[PDB]
Amino acid sequence: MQPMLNIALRAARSAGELIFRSIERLDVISVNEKDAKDYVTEVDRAAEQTIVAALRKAYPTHAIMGEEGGLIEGSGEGADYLWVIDPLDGTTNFIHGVPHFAVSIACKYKGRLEHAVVLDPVRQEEFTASRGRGAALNGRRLRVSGRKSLEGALLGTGFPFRDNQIDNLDNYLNMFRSLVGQTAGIRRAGAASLDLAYVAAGRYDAFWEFGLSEWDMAAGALLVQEAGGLVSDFTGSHEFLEKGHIVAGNTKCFKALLTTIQPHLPPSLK
Amino acid sequence: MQPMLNIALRAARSAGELIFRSIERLDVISVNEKDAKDYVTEVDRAAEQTIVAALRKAYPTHAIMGEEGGLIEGSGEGADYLWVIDPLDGTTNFIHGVPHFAVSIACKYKGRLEHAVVLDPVRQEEFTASRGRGAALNGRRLRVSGRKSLEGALLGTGFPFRDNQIDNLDNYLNMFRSLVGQTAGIRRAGAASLDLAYVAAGRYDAFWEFGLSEWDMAAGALLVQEAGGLVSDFTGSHEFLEKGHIVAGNTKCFKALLTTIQPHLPPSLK
Numbered sequence: 001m002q003p004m005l006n007i008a009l010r011a012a013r014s015a016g017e018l019i020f021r022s023i024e025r026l027d028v029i030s031v032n033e034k035d036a037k038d039y040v041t042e043v044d045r046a047a048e049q050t051i052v053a054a055l056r057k058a059y060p061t062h063a064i065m066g067e068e069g070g071l072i073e074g075s076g077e078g079a080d081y082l083w084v085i086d087p088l089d090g091t092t093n094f095i096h097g098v099p100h101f102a103v104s105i106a107c108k109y110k111g112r113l114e115h116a117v118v119l120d121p122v123r124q125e126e127f128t129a130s131r132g133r134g135a136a137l138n139g140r141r142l143r144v145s146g147r148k149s150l151e152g153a154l155l156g157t158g159f160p161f162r163d164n165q166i167d168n169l170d171n172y173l174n175m176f177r178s179l180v181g182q183t184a185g186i187r188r189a190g191a192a193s194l195d196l197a198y199v200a201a202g203r204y205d206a207f208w209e210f211g212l213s214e215w216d217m218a219a220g221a222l223l224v225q226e227a228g229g230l231v232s233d234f235t236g237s238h239e240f241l242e243k244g245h246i247v248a249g250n251t252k253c254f255k256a257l258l259t260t261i262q263p264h265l266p267p268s269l270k
Numbered sequence: 271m272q273p274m275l276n277i278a279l280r281a282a283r284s285a286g287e288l289i290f291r292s293i294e295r296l297d298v299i300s301v302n303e304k305d306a307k308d309y310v311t312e313v314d315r316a317a318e319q320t321i322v323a324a325l326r327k328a329y330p331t332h333a334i335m336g337e338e339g340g341l342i343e344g345s346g347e348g349a350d351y352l353w354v355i356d357p358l359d360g361t362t363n364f365i366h367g368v369p370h371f372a373v374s375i376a377c378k379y380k381g382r383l384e385h386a387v388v389l390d391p392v393r394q395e396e397f398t399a400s401r402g403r404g405a406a407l408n409g410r411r412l413r414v415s416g417r418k419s420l421e422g423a424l425l426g427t428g429f430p431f432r433d434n435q436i437d438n439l440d441n442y443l444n445m446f447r448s449l450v451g452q453t454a455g456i457r458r459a460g461a462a463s464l465d466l467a468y469v470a471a472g473r474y475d476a477f478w479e480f481g482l483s484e485w486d487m488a489a490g491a492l493l494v495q496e497a498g499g500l501v502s503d504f505t506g507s508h509e510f511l512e513k514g515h516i517v518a519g520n521t522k523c524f525k526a527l528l529t530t531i532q533p534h535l536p537p538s539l540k
């Protein structure tokens with residue numbers, strides 16, 4: 001891999017080790033729900049510090065973006081590079097003790113995905129990719145599935161909003177209803193980055209979600225493109241990071257899933 | 271532990287080793303669609319034989335009822351024991367290469383759940399219980415969560431039915447709609463056994479599903495009861511194993527989920 005992807009990978013590993021070590025005290029701390037959520041914010045910030053420290057040791061002039069910290073611009077040539085970091089994808093799973101969550105690290109050069117790490121530290125699954133270098137899971141070269149249609153497909157989605165609102169719920173369930181009929185299953189495991197990784201690995205045949213922020217999609221999107229898959233927003237265009245709505249799949253199941261949800265979209269998602 | 275639970279646990283381990291070894295040859299699947307389902311049948315039958323050989327080595331007079339093999343009756347005093355086995359719960363996940371599935375073994379004495387093992391061989395998480403001894407995860411005592419209401423709750427569910435048409439999905443989504451309300455999330459992960467285990471561990475606050483077979487509910491239902499939790503069918507009665515509909519939770523989330531679904535059941539599930 002590129003030295004840059006190796007540094008992203010090593011960062012993701014250190015953060016995942018700290019997050020992994022952090023899940024034990026939760027069931028002990030879980031008795032105070034608000035104090036438990038405060039603790040998870042603190043674990044997330046410790047994970048962000050671990051990632052940023054490792055990245056900035058190799059590239060102190062790069063720009064960095066996170067949910068909480070926002071955009072910190074670079075300097076010189078480094079102004080062109082942007083690290084998009086989600087230190088813990090699947091915070092609801094994490095607070096409940098559900099072992100399915102991940103560190104997510106993307107590197108963008110002039111707005112285009114260059115490098116991606118999605119790291120499951122419980123299963124110790126390291127998903128990696130660089131633009132034009134392909135995708136891998138623990139060093140095994142990854143490829144999207146061969147499935148030709150939604151019949152007998154396994155699809156993923158989520159509902160990533162921090163409150164259950166009826167407009168988002170109605171539109172979400174409209175699409176869900178329309179998408180059940182044929183599939184071998186529909187999966188809601190609760191971490192967008194792992195869903196996109198699973199499409200890249202051939203474990204899922206397609207994935208769709210709206211309401212996502214860039215840090216939840218960026219790495220998974222490169223994994224899927226480098227796996228020979230397709231990624232778009234709900235209009236079929238390439239602004240999934242900016243719009244928050246994404247369809248990702250193998251080529252055929254991507255097209256069928258994108259076409260299937262259009263009749264159910266409000267103009268908001270068009 | 272009791273020798274009988276130890277034998278259950280050892281059998282679950284050997285089947286998990288075989289299923290784990292069987293996931294590597296998949297190369298995250300998509301070989302031939304038709305060949306893949308047959309492979310799953312082969313893996314499941316090999317695993318059921320591995321479990322049954324350990325069960326009959328220790329207890330040759332016990333009755334045994336498997337997902338593959340169906341019901342084989344016992345003899346003498348052994349006739350009082352029924353082993354209810356799913357050698358691989360989460361077959362659709364397994365065939366796609368999604369690493370979330372479990373071996374599930376219950377033992378019933380005179381109609382009553384007596385022993386339970388649910389084993390996740392990827393995360394190597396061994397959930398165990400005997401009537402009156404409590405439940406454990408890798409030997410560590412389990413207790414259902416403290417959450418007092420469905421507000422910020424995490425729910426588990428699934429809908430394995432695929433009819434020619436969307437009627438049965440409609441009734442399922444009637445229940446789903448009524449249950450979203452104030453919840454933090456719902457999960458659709460593909461293995462009922464692990465969802466009931468997750469209620470028993472405090473990882474889910476409650477769970478509901480209909481169309482389930484006994485071998486997928488039996489072990490998880492004892493895990494929940496021994497974790498201080500509640501199990502019933504969709505009417506609030508205790509015919510979940512026979513009817514295929516089940517609600518499991520901590521005290522308050524079990525009651526609130528039971529209350530919320532009552533108006534939304536079809537006469538099918540009364």
Ligand SMILES: O=C(O)c1cc(O)c(O)c(O)c1
Nearest residue numbers: 092158159160190454455456
């Ligand atoms: O219940 C859901 O719709 C759901 C809940 C979540 O908290 C979540 O992250 C997800 O991806 C889906």
Ligand SMILES: O=C(O)c1cc(O)c(O)c(O)c1
Nearest residue numbers: 427428429430459460461462
């Ligand atoms: O078919 C099943 O055993 C099943 C299907 C699901 O959609 C699901 O979430 C689950 O826990 C189990």
